[PDB]
Amino acid sequence: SVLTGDNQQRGSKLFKITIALSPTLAHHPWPGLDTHEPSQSSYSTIVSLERLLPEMTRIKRNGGRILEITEGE
Amino acid sequence: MQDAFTKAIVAADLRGSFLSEQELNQLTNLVKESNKRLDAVNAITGNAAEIISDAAHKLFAEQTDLIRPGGNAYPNRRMAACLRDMEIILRYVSYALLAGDASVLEDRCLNGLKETYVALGTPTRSVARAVQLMKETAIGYVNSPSGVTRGDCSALVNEAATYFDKAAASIA
Amino acid sequence: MQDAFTKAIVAADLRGSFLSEQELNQLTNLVKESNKRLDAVNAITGNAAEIISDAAHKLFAEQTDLIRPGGNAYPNRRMAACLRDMEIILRYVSYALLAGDASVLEDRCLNGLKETYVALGTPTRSVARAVQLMKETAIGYVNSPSGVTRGDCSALVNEAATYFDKAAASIA
Amino acid sequence: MQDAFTKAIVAADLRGSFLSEQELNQLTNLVKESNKRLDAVNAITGNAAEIISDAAHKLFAEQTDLIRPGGNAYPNRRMAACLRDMEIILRYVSYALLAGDASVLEDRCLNGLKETYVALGTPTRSVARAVQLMKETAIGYVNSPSGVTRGDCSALVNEAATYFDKAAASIA
Amino acid sequence: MKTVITEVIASADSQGRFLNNTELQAANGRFQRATASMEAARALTSNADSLVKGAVQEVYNKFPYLTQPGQMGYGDTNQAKCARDISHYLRFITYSLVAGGTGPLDDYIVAGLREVNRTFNLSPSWYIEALKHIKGKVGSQLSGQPLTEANAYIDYCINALS
Amino acid sequence: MKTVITEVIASADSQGRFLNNTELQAANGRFQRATASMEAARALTSNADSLVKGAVQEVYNKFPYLTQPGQMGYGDTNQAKCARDISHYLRFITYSLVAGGTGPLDDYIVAGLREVNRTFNLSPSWYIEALKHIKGKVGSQLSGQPLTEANAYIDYCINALS
Amino acid sequence: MKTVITEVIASADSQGRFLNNTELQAANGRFQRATASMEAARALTSNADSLVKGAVQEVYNKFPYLTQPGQMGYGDTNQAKCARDISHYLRFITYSLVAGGTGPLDDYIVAGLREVNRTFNLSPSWYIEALKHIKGKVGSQLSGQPLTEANAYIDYCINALS
Amino acid sequence: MKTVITEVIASADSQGRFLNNTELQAANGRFQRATASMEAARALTSNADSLVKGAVQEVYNKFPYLTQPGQMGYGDTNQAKCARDISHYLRFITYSLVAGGTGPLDDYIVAGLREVNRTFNLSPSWYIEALKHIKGKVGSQLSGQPLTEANAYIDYCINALS
Amino acid sequence: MNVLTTSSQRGGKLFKVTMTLSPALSHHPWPSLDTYEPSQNSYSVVVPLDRLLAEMTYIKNKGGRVLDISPADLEALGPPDISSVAIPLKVELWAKADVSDVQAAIVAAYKQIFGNTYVLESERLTSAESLLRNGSISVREFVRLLAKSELYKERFFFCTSNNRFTELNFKHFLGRAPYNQSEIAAHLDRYQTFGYDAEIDSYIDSDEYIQAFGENVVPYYRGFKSQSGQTVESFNRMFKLYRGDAGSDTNLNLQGQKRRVDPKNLLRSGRGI
Ligand SMILES: *[C@H](C)[C@H]1/C(=C/c2[nH]c(/C=C3N=C(/C=C4\NC(=O)C(CC)=C4C)C(C)=C\3CCC(=O)O)c(CCC(=O)O)c2C)NC(=O)[C@@H]1C
Ligand SMILES: *[C@H](C)[C@H]1/C(=C/c2[nH]c(/C=C3N=C(/C=C4\NC(=O)C(CC)=C4C)C(C)=C\3CCC(=O)O)c(CCC(=O)O)c2C)NC(=O)[C@@H]1C
Ligand SMILES: *[C@H](C)[C@H]1/C(=C/c2[nH]c(/C=C3N=C(/C=C4\NC(=O)C(CC)=C4C)C(C)=C\3CCC(=O)O)c(CCC(=O)O)c2C)NC(=O)[C@@H]1C
Ligand SMILES: *[C@H](C)[C@H]1/C(=C/c2[nH]c(/C=C3N=C(/C=C4\NC(=O)C(CC)=C4C)C(C)=C\3CCC(=O)O)c(CCC(=O)O)c2C)NC(=O)[C@@H]1C
Ligand SMILES: *[C@H](C)[C@H]1/C(=C/c2[nH]c(/C=C3N=C(/C=C4\NC(=O)C(CC)=C4C)C(C)=C\3CCC(=O)O)c(CCC(=O)O)c2C)NC(=O)[C@@H]1C
Ligand SMILES: *[C@H](C)[C@H]1/C(=C/c2[nH]c(/C=C3N=C(/C=C4\NC(=O)C(CC)=C4C)C(C)=C\3CCC(=O)O)c(CCC(=O)O)c2C)NC(=O)[C@@H]1C
Ligand SMILES: *[C@H](C)[C@H]1/C(=C/c2[nH]c(/C=C3N=C(/C=C4\NC(=O)C(CC)=C4C)C(C)=C\3CCC(=O)O)c(CCC(=O)O)c2C)NC(=O)[C@@H]1C
Ligand SMILES: *[C@H](C)[C@H]1/C(=C/c2[nH]c(/C=C3N=C(/C=C4\NC(=O)C(CC)=C4C)C(C)=C\3CCC(=O)O)c(CCC(=O)O)c2C)NC(=O)[C@@H]1C
Ligand SMILES: *[C@H](C)[C@H]1/C(=C/c2[nH]c(/C=C3N=C(/C=C4\NC(=O)C(CC)=C4C)C(C)=C\3CCC(=O)O)c(CCC(=O)O)c2C)NC(=O)[C@@H]1C
Ligand SMILES: *[C@H](C)[C@H]1/C(=C/c2[nH]c(/C=C3N=C(/C=C4\NC(=O)C(CC)=C4C)C(C)=C\3CCC(=O)O)c(CCC(=O)O)c2C)NC(=O)[C@@H]1C
Ligand SMILES: *[C@H](C)[C@H]1/C(=C/c2[nH]c(/C=C3N=C(/C=C4\NC(=O)C(CC)=C4C)C(C)=C\3CCC(=O)O)c(CCC(=O)O)c2C)NC(=O)[C@@H]1C
């Protein structure tokens, strides 16, 4: 997701993170086995350095792995 | 408590005004029906015992478990209560019918009845059922008397219904 | 949620029975009126804005103090709320009218409403008043429309009333 | 109950100790003021009726709606209550003033007051207002009496204020 | 609120008993009376204003000094109030006629009457005159039972005031 | 004894107040009704006997076994009592019509009814039939309001018995 | 807690009336006395300790057997307690002088005195001696009204104990 | 009758306890004050008459219309009564000073005040002026505590009247 | 407790009064020191309006003290209907959402995140809304922004206690109510060192959030239906936290922000700390 402007209000250096998505990370609210969205198997988000460690750890424990990290600017 | 007349007053009071002529005409006509109204009440009271007796029989024929050990109408002690309650509800309904207003029934009897029943483990549904059974029987009398001047009581009959139903609903 | 049909079902279910033929005939009839029913709703929705606007004007002409400093409709922020509330109540009422059942109105809107108003210090009396003011205006439209096939809507009109009144009562 | 003396005791008790000489000197001087203290009280009690009467007039001149149909001070019955209440609060305040301690006031009088007012739909704001109106009038007398030895009562005057204010706050 | 109908209900309710013939007889009494009562109310409601003017006025004739400066009758605010008040009395009376009991009167007017009047230094006397003057006027527009009813209620207040 | 008149007095008395319009309205009701009530009583009083015979009789038809030896209906003493009793019921009813309230019924008949009946093993059922049979006959000699009144009271007992 | 001031408030409060002259007179009494009372307290507070030693001691002289092994007076723990206790009595007395009422005494010492003493087999007698011995000593350090006050309170306990 | 002394007895008596130091303190207060109180009474008692004349008079100045024919202030009987009445008020006040409590006032004057006044249409207002006028005069003959006392009691009535 | 009649036989609005009982107020007819029945430490009475003044004065003149007064009509009302929260409904914001769908989400989010509480035109956040619907922000991220926003702080966090704010938070961010005293304690400590932002972050970051409505689903009410690792009492606490439809979390009302869940009730579910 290309940042239109600095997403976060609170300010630090921001880094774009592209992740391969497990069904768990974004389960659809559907009956049966939850499916992540087809259109994005690789969600990309913008994160502040402070949040970067929590975001990565949560991504890690869920199936999906970091495809790439890029500084948001 | 409250009734049709008093009510209209109170409304008028908050507006701070004399009664509207329109409003008088509600009361004027209400008076005219009195005689019918009265007979209706008289019919219930006259048949009271029966109404209940009847309803009960039917209630227990339907929900046989209530009267089996472990049910809520067993043993005698409980049964007695259940009968007593039915009656009360009836009494209040009649009162309302005379007043020409739900209030008396709701404030004295219905407000909190559900919760009581719940706490005890009385099945509210069955209670409601009973109330209806009563309703039908009661109307039966109201609507089919002998030696009264023949005429149309529908208006009253329906209002009666409503009262019964408010009861059924709030209990249920 | 619930409406006229579903309701009758549910009742029937607890008895454990197929729907009584008598009961079908309630619903059968209800269907026939549909068209009328619909137009009624359509009339409210079409006039919505106005209904409110109107009622408000009258509300504030009566209870001048609400709009005076220290009153409950002052300042702007509060006024705004008061308007929106009126509207909401209306919205629900309409919904009910279509459903053919109070429920939706009771559950979403009326339930807890009194207490809220109390906690805020909103004067429940005035709220109720507003609701009535609305009622009358609304009926006005329901009952006097344009380009509609002429016939009798009374039945619907009264049911409408009742809804408004349930509201008035439970708020008050 | 409690008052200035008793209080100091109690504190001392929990420490488990005889009263500190320092602490005695609080009480010693407190005694010395007695006479002033008394006159203060005497002034209120002597003027009681008036204090209230006065405050009321002013209260109703400000908040006209209280006395209009639909308001909280209407009708007579309600008005009466409102007056009665004012007085009570006053009575307590005086008591405190003599004791030299808020407690009595808080425990007998203020405790639960807000909630009552709320439940009734009495507008707490207005109540508070009344209390202040009273305060000012009362001080008026405390501070301008007849036949009293001229001297400084400020200390007492302020304490009086505080009591009134605790009241205002907890009600509001 | 005390009306015939409410009372019998109440009495029945206390004993825990159905409304039997006893009570209905009573009810029948009310509602029979209503026709007259209602008539009276229509008459008062219509002439309200005029009755009020006349009364207020009267009071001043009866107690000239009230209109002097530094008195209660003096300055418009007070006059306005004076009017308002009497209106009320009247209003309630009509109510009571229609309700068929003193109820409305008792709860609005009578309960707390004394203390209010004491604290604001309203002299009962005044009100009374107002009423009397009224009674006299009403004694023209009405007749027979309608009249009788009107009186009863008017008086009821006189007695409460005094 | 509970009649309309006594009650309003009582209520007035409890509150500690003079009889005001409220109560008189009620009283008036009682008095206007009386004319019908009184009529009914004259009618019952006259046909008393015949009503009684008919009733007693009925009961036996309804419950044949009572007349068999070793039963309660059997042997004249019992029959005499049975007659006596019903007479009483009737007597009281008349009273109540005239008094304009259930009072007389309540105090003579109803209070203690159950226990008496229990201890002597009188079956309510019987009495009831008696009454019903009566009601049916009365439903010829009377008409309109007079009738209505008669019924009310007769029933009142049925309900008390049951 | 019962002091002069609290009581008059209470009495006023019960009847539902403002503090009038009656009560203030009373209050005034409390305040005038205070000067003497306060003096007494300063005197006891200062000599506390010495009074306590003396008392404890006395008790043992009076009841030699207490100090024998297997008795209550025997072994330091008990002696410590004995000291503590008397300290308390004293402490409270001072309090009461200052508070200008028995209040403090009543609530700490007196209420429940008996049962405590019963369950732990403390003999009232002992305490009493303690007090008496005290009273005697106090009867030197003080004089006139100050003295009188001291006594009153000391006694108050004697009577409660006995 | 409520005086300091009676009250403490009462309170003591209710609880079922002996008079302890608490109460005596209170009593002492009453006795110390007495000297001032007594003085005040001697002063009022002496000037009684003159105070009364002045008051009665005042009232008429304040409410001229009273002296007109057909009013209450008119015709000697009434004037005599008016005098008498005020005398009473005064008399009692003195009593209360001496008794050291409102008691005398409460029982003679205050209890039943309202209803008496209502039934005979005596306007509280009048009395009040009387008192006020008095208070003003007394405010010359007396001084210091004696004065203070006099006021207290005089006021006490003002408040009761209003 | 339940009250069975709203009004006395003589017309009169009954009012339930709750007091802490005192030995003087009621005592056993037993020898020895008077004791109130332990079960009635908090006694409740329903009194008509007329006797209310006398009743309350007497209570207070003894050592009683009034816990709360409440009109009998509000009392003896049905427990709120759970109809709308039994099955929440749920909103998914697809990618390539058309204009309307984005609007619906926004509305729904404001509803759940703020309670019934109304958000005015000026209060509403254009910027945050802007981001959603040209991508860039997840529904999850929007939700974070709302809880960061001052609007949120002013209503929930700046008026009430942190104790109250926690459960207030729980309900908005997770349908659940709080289970156990520990959760309340943990959040409080987080807030003291990390501050307000970190605490807000810890609910959205939590796996319970992720497991249900993890991304691009507007939060819904999980409580009122059976959840894993949820204390049974939590379900009852959900009835206290959630009062009816058209009942809100409002700073605005008198003494607006108080605790729906008593501290003791939390202790029952679990203790340890
Ligand atoms: C009968 C149709 C059903 C039924 C009834 C039932 N009720 C109870 C217990 C009580 N009922 C009430 C309710 C009232 N008392 C009143 O004063 C009023 C008017 C305000 C009502 C309507 C009360 C007070 C009780 C509890 C105490 C009592 O027994 O009086 C029972 C007994 C329950 C028990 O545990 O003993 C029963 C059986 N339940 C059924 O089975 C029927 C479907
Ligand atoms: C309606 C449910 C059924 C019905 C009623 C009915 N009643 C009347 C007329 C009267 N009924 C009464 C009855 C009373 N008046 C009283 O004062 C009392 C209490 C003491 C009663 C019970 C009276 C007196 C009248 C007036 C004339 C008469 O002789 O009955 C009518 C006729 C219409 C009217 O209002 O007059 C009717 C229709 N009968 C029916 O047809 C319904 C089934
Ligand atoms: C009643 C409040 C007033 C009134 C209404 C009325 N309407 C009809 C008949 C119809 N009205 C509609 C309208 C709709 N049907 C729909 O499906 C929708 C929503 C898409 C609407 C708005 C229709 C289609 C009919 C039937 C065709 C026709 O118009 O004739 C009637 C006639 C009764 C009947 O249809 O059985 C009436 C009375 N007219 C009044 O006079 C009332 C003030
Ligand atoms: C007067 C300034 C305002 C006012 C007062 C008002 N109060 C009531 C009713 C009550 N007020 C109280 C007061 C107290 N309860 C206590 O515990 C204490 C302290 C010890 C007090 C002072 C109570 C108990 C009641 C309810 C019972 C009663 O009859 O008093 C009313 C009447 C409410 C009603 O609906 O009847 C009023 C009007 N309200 C105003 O309008 C003023 C702003
Ligand atoms: C303070 C608000 C005003 C004020 C007070 C003031 N009073 C005194 C002195 C006394 N006041 C009293 C009054 C009483 N003593 C009692 O025992 C009773 C109850 C029966 C009362 C009402 C007394 C006895 C005294 C002592 C003698 C005297 O009057 O002088 C003073 C003087 C200083 C002092 O503390 O004694 C003062 C200042 N005077 C003001 O200026 C204020 C307006
Ligand atoms: C008319 C004869 C005299 C007069 C009257 C007057 N009244 C007031 C003030 C009040 N009047 C009432 C009376 C009522 N208010 C009610 O709610 C009811 C029951 C429905 C009544 C009968 C009240 C309560 C007040 C108090 C304050 C208020 O206005 O509400 C005044 C003002 C006196 C003052 O200073 O407060 C007056 C003057 N006016 C005249 O000129 C006549 C002498
Ligand atoms: C008639 C339907 C049946 C019948 C009746 C019968 N009754 C008794 C005995 C008593 N019956 C009554 C009734 C009343 N006595 C009163 O004082 C009143 C109130 C005014 C009533 C209603 C009473 C009290 C008695 C008991 C005392 C007595 O001896 O009368 C009997 C005799 C029972 C016995 O055990 O001897 C009988 C048989 N007889 C029939 O044939 C019918 C079956
Ligand atoms: C001294 C004259 C004798 C003595 C006394 C002694 N006391 C205890 C134990 C207790 N003493 C008290 C007394 C008080 N505790 C209080 O809280 C108060 C109110 C301020 C008093 C007056 C109490 C309650 C105890 C019981 C337990 C406790 O720990 O206090 C003992 C110990 C006896 C025992 O059974 O434990 C003794 C011996 N000691 C002497 O040497 C004298 C004979
Ligand atoms: C004086 C300000 C006005 C006045 C007074 C006046 N009073 C009466 C009649 C009574 N006055 C009282 C008062 C008291 N009697 C007592 O026993 C006591 C307590 C010791 C008091 C305060 C009473 C009881 C009466 C009524 C019975 C009686 O005759 O004494 C009148 C006569 C009024 C009448 O007869 O209706 C008058 C005129 N007179 C004036 O000039 C002033 C206006
Ligand atoms: C003693 C081992 C511990 C202790 C006890 C203690 N209890 C209280 C006060 C109360 N205790 C009770 C207990 C009961 N009341 C009952 O009716 C029953 C049986 C049915 C019990 C068990 C109650 C109700 C009270 C409070 C009111 C009363 O006095 O009856 C206290 C005093 C508390 C106070 O401040 O009043 C104490 C000390 N506490 C200890 O210190 C011991 C560990
Ligand atoms: C207008 C007729 C009267 C009025 C209303 C008023 N309401 C509020 C505040 C709120 N009212 C509600 C209402 C509802 N919540 C719902 O969800 C529904 C049904 C779904 C309704 C109808 C709510 C939630 C609130 C609280 C939230 C908020 O206030 O933002 C106020 C404002 C209170 C304040 O002090 O700010 C007002 C003024 N009050 C009047 O003056 C009229 C009599």
Author numbering:
A (entry chain A): 1 to 73
B (entry chain O), C (entry chain F), D (entry chain U): 1 to 172
E (entry chain N), F (entry chain R), G (entry chain T), H (entry chain P): 1 to 162
I (entry chain M): 1 to 273
From the paper:
Cyanobacteria and red algae use extramembranous antenna megacomplexes called phycobilisomes (PBSs), composed of phycobiliproteins (PBPs), to harvest light. A typical PBS contains an allophycocyanin (AP) core—two, three, or five cylinders of (αβ)3 trimers of AP—and a set of radiating rods—stacks of hexamers formed by αβ protomers of phycocyanin (PC) and, in red algae and some cyanobacteria, phycoerythrin (PE). Here, we reconstructed a cryo–electron microscopy structure of the >10-megadalton Gloeobacter violaceus PBS, with diverging, conformationally mobile bundles of rods composed of stacked phycoerythrin and phycocyanin hexamers, stemming from a pentacylindrical allophycocyanin core belted by auxiliary phycocyanin hexamers. The bundle-shaped morphology is maintained by linker proteins, including the multidomain linkers Glr1262 and Glr2806, which are unique to Gloeobacter.
The reconstructed cryo-EM structure revealed three pairs of C2 symmetry–related rods stemming from the top of the pentacylindrical AP core (R1/R1′, R2/R2′, and R3/R3′). Unexpectedly, the rods formed two bundles (R1-R2-R3 and R1′-R2′-R3′) that radiated at ~15° angle so that the first-level PE (αβ)6 hexamers in rods R2/R2′ became ~145 Å apart. We located the conserved rod linkers, CpcC1 and CpcC2 (22), which contain pfam01383 and pfam00427 domains that connect two neighboring PC layers. The density helped unequivocally localize Glr1262 on the first level of PC hexamers in the rods, consistent with its predicted position. The three REP domains (pfam00427) of Glr1262 were identified at vertices of an equilateral triangle, which corresponded to the cavities of three PC hexamers that formed the base of a rod bundle. (C) Topology of the two copies of Glr1262 on top of the core showing relative positions of the repeat domains REP1, REP2, and REP3 that attach bases of the rods R1/R1′, R2/R2′, and R3/R3′, respectively, by clustering them as two rod bundles. # indicates the C terminus of the Glr1262 chain. Two copies of Glr1262, each with three REP domains, are necessary and sufficient to cluster the six rods symmetrically into two triangular rod bundles. The bundles of rods position multiple PCB chromophores within 35 Å of each other, which is sufficient for interrod EET.
